[PDB]
Design a protein around this ligand. Structure first.
Ligand SMILES: C=CC1=C(C)/C(=C/C2=NC(=C3\c4[nH]c(Cc5[nH]c(C=O)c(C)c5CC)c(C)c4C(=O)[C@@H]3C(=O)OC)/[C@@H](CCC(=O)O)[C@@H]2C)NC1=O
Ligand SMILES: C=CC1=C(C)/C(=C/C2=NC(=C3\c4[nH]c(Cc5[nH]c(C=O)c(C)c5CC)c(C)c4C(=O)[C@@H]3C(=O)OC)/[C@@H](CCC(=O)O)[C@@H]2C)NC1=O
Ligand code: NA
Ligand code: NA
Lengths: 265, 271
């Protein structure tokens, strides 16, 4: 269990737990046991400059879920600075068309937040999917709400892919600053927002009893290609050239092997 | 009784940018632009009461040309609020004989508070599915530089549209900007010193890297061709039934709208 969240702050560490828990609970009926070798559920750099923990529960069949993943990456920058990442991502299989789920707190020095329900179909070709999963809900409210905060501004990634892989309502934020209020921000706004978002994913994207015969060979293969494309790109950009570094060639390869396998790539 | 290239109600700087822009297009694509065949009724029109006045300019592309058609326009309208709305724009649309990006530049001044600028090379293929399309037309270029460059200016800020559709229909490098204040004096400087160069450079990459002659002998495969067709349909469809279908009957009265919306839907090839 990576539920320890060692290096993070209590407030941050607390959000990750509530979030992860809700996930595993509201979904027990459809999630399988974590079947990762202890060698992957927890790993670090030989020299001890970086430690991490992974948690991956795959979905049962008949279930709309492909798999879920939680993790925290703690590293020590040779510049004396410490990088700490904590995330939770939900991936759906092609038996469903509904958006995925992702929340991430990223802090190298301020703090970067990523909260969103990643669309799984082209929104320009499918104007109805846009209406169904984003207009109707209130995903945009959470983004705008967080914006009002003075020490909170829009975060635009250096990667164009990242920018396009996220939905129009996705919350990509850079919260500048000074513990004190930061933790207040997390507990009073971020968490409420993050939990609300996850809420919509569960009750409207995962839970369901409508999809008879729907999603035919073509539309379905469409999804598997797009999901595959996305999953591969993101692993080649975040792992392939960032892991051999943080934990040495020995580790990465085996951890990235597991992941690429978990991701079907 | 104003012509398209007259741009009556806006300012000199804005008016000049729109003229330079449309002319560069017309001059640089002489070889493949067909002349405007819009009836007088559609080139220029207004609401019988005098509240709204508009001018349209559409040049369809010849066959063998990668161009669907280019359209230029300006809408002047006086809101029951006592305030006036002015929109000027130029869009370039490519047909299925190519996969290359489209082109758009729009200036929108609803209130006397802010001028909204929309400058982008709208993508025509899904970027997550086609990462190479993303690398070819966006990374490789310097399109994002225009966006962050213009953003440094204190008076300039991000403009996030009420419409989720609009938010997705644009490329990640698009410049969706909200330019501050009515400090006429400084506004005119920005458009003159920054927006103009930015737009002409953007239009420049469209002309020489999306449209550009060279070996245009590249045939869009059978299935890629159909996707483009479908996605272009969807986009145009949405775009018109959102901007025109809900706003025109209001601005110029049912009589004119149906006439101009009909001409537009025809040039966009929709049903
Ligand atoms: C839907 C799921 C996901 C999305 C959308 C996602 C997005 C982003 N991750 C970044 C980063 C990142 N991620 C990880 C972990 C990780 N990545 C994957 C990918 O498949 C997996 C499975 C895992 C778990 C093992 C590390 C170690 C790490 C960085 O060092 C990097 C970062 O913070 O640098 C400052 C950001 C790129 C930077 C940018 O904005 O230009 C970008 C925001 N990461 C997702 O997991
Ligand atoms: C590739 C081409 C185009 C793109 C991509 C495009 C995008 C946008 N137009 C908006 C608007 C808009 N457009 C027009 C004219 C017009 N629309 C079409 C559509 O097919 C045609 C053919 C024409 C005739 C030339 C009017 C009158 C009008 C508004 O009142 C509205 C606006 O700004 O209100 C403040 C924005 C809505 C969301 C927002 O507020 O951010 C959004 C940014 N408009 C294009 O023309
Ligand atoms: Na703010
Ligand atoms: Na600025």
């Amino acid at each position: 269990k990576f539920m320890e969240f060692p290096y993070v702050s209590p407030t941050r560490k607390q959000l990750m737990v509530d979030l992860m828990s809700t996930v595993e609970n509201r979904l027990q009926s459809q999630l399988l046991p974590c079947n990762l070798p202890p060698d992957v559920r927890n790993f670090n750099n030989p020299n001890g400059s970086a430690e991490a923990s992974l948690h991956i529960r795959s979905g049962d069949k008949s279930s709309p879920i492909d798999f879920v993943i939680g993790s925290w990456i703690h590293c020590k920058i040779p510049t004396g600075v410490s990088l700490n990442i904590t995330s939770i991502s939900g991936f759906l299989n092609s038996s469903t068309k509904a958006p995925n789920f992702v929340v991430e707190l990223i802090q190298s020095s301020s703090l970067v937040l990523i909260l969103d329900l990643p669309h799984r179909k082209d929104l320009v070709l499918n104007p109805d999917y846009l209406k169904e999963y984003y207009q109707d809900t209130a995903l945009d409210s959470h983004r705008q709400s967080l914006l009002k905060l003075p020490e909170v501004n829009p975060y635009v990634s250096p990667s164009l892919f990242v920018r396009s892989a996220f939905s129009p309502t996705a919350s990509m934020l850079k919260i500048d600053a000074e513990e004190d209020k930061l933790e207040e921000i997390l507990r009073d706004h971020v968490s409420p927002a993050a939990k609300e978002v996850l809420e919509v994913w569960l009750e409207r994207c995962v839970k369901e009893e409508e999809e008879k015969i729907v999603v035919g060979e073509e539309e379905r293969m469409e999804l598997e290609r797009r999901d595959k494309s996305f999953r591969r790109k993101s692993i080649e950009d975040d792992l392939d050239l960032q892991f051999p570094r943080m934990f040495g060639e020995e580790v990465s390869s085996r951890v990235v092997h597991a992941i690429k396998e978990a991701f079907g790539v």
